[PDB]
Copies of this chain bind each other. A is one copy, B any other.
């Protein structure tokens, strides 16, 4: 192939290259345990948006519906837009519109078998520009998680372990903080789920290092998800169970 991997190019270029590479790696990986392939989403819209491509999988023997998208955007933030984003971004300062760049990969996969879990993954980068085009205010965001129909603790444990290992390669203080905590909190305070990791407005380290952190996080996905799906996709289940799980999670409207 041809993905770039040095350290000299602007973060925006390295990040776009990274997500385009992972989109191909992930679709290929998922296809390795199914019987169908992903295909470009050439749906008729008016303003489809995005800059990259949208890959969709459907009616497979393992994955009923899924999509992996890469989007890149160049634009400007008006004073009003900045004002609406300010509270979630510690360094976003209005100082007349300001140019920005953003890109990210987003995906959602829904297995056919209720014993296998749905997964969501998203890694993105955002930066406003200085007059000279260099990054002014920037941050990374993203993470990944599992939403089970039938819950298997071992699966949640493996998913978390590999993402923890990814984050530990940079700072062991990251995983405990990035671990999704809310649902678990409500579960305890009240008399269940899997979750995963999530971070946003993350600009606390050298961006070149966060780039690598994101790459390592991406790399915790296939080893955990493929392993999990392999051990659940061929488990027995009745049409009734599948139908109830669909009602419980409203899957029909999720992919329509």
Measuring CB to CB, which residues of chain A are less than 8 angstroms from any residue of chain B? 41, 43, 45-50, 54, 56, 58-59, 64-69, 71, 73-78, 80-81, 84-85, 87-88, 100, 102-104, 106-108, 112, 115, 120, 122, 124, 126, 141, 150-151, 177, 180, 182, 185-186, 190, 192, 200, 236-244, 246-256
Contacts and interface: CB of A to CB of B under 8 A. Distances in A.
Contacts of A76: 238, 240
Number of copies of chain A assembled together: 2
A25 B238 CA distance: 33
Task: Tell me the dominant secondary structure on chain A's binding face.
Answer: mixed
A187 to B, nearest CB: 10
A56 B256 contact: yes
Contact of A75 (B84, B182, B238): B238
Contacts of A73: 240, 243-244, 247
A104 B247 contact: yes
Contacts of A247: 50, 71, 73, 102-104, 106, 124
Contacts of A59: 45-46
Please give me the 6 A-B residue pairs with the lowest Cβ-Cβ distance, nearest first: A75-B240, A106-B250, A255-B256, A67-B253, A182-B182, A104-B247
